[PDB]
DNA sequence: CCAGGTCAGAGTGACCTGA
DNA sequence: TCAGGTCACTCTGACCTGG
């Protein structure tokens, strides 16, 4: 377990996955996306923060891409 | 026949004091047995988008009078 | 060490069941 | 009629294994 944080949601990172530090959740979520159509119910600017229980599927995927997952 | 006052899907009956669909019925059922909005507490709740933000779906349930 | 797979855990909603 | 239960379906993510 690395002393690093997930660049997507701020949870503890499990490792360096798809080119970014990420948790198992965000790793699998991105994994499943490369194999989807999400719609943000708000304005495409949702906070992704695991500790505060904030997430949005569309904005989660956009943030995965934003921070550099490939 | 009436529409669900929470999401606009077809209503199945009068549940918890509100005309509503089986989805919103069950969702409120589970809530009364905690949700945070990642946006601005104004997320769209409709038959397409209702599953997306739990916090706003519950607030919409309360707004239209589910008890 | 990580990519990709696995499947128990959890939310959904159409349908069930008793008051 | 409705309140509350059911459970197949599906997404989630903790853990595994091979590389
Ligand atoms: Na997914
Ligand atoms: Zn994460
Ligand atoms: Zn969003
Ligand atoms: Zn509804
Ligand atoms: Zn919301």
Residue A49 tokens read as 């923060």
> What domain range includes position B55?
1-67
Number of structural domains found in chain B: 1
Distance in Å, CA B25 to ligand 2 centroid: 32
* Measured CA distances, B5 to A27, A61, A65, B13, B64 (Å): 38, 30, 36, 11, 7
**Beta carbons of B53 and A49 less than 8 Å apart:** no
DSSP state of B13: E
- Beta carbon of A23 within 7 Å of strand D? yes
How many angstroms separate the most distant Cα atoms in chain B? Answer: 34
To one decimal, the resolution in angstroms is 1.7
Method: X-ray
**Beta carbons of B49 and A43 less than 8 Å apart:** no
Integer-rounded Cα Rg, in Å, for chain B is: 11
- What is the distance between the terminal CA atoms of chain A, rounded to a whole angstrom? 22
Distance in Å, CA B6 to ligand 1 centroid: 26
CATH of the domain at B12: 3.30.50.10
Q: What does the alpha-carbon distance between residue B25 and residue B16 come to, in Å, rounded to a whole number?
A: 8
């Amino acid at each position: 377990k690395p002393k690093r944080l997930c660049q997507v949601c701020g949870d503890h990172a499990s490792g360096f996955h798809y080119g970014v530090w990420s948790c198992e959740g965000c790793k699998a979520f991105f994994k499943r996306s490369i194999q989807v159509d999400y719609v943000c119910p708000a304005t495409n600017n949702c906070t992704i923060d695991k500790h505060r229980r904030k997430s949005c599927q569309a904005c989660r995927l956009r943030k995965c891409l934003e921070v550099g997952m490939t």
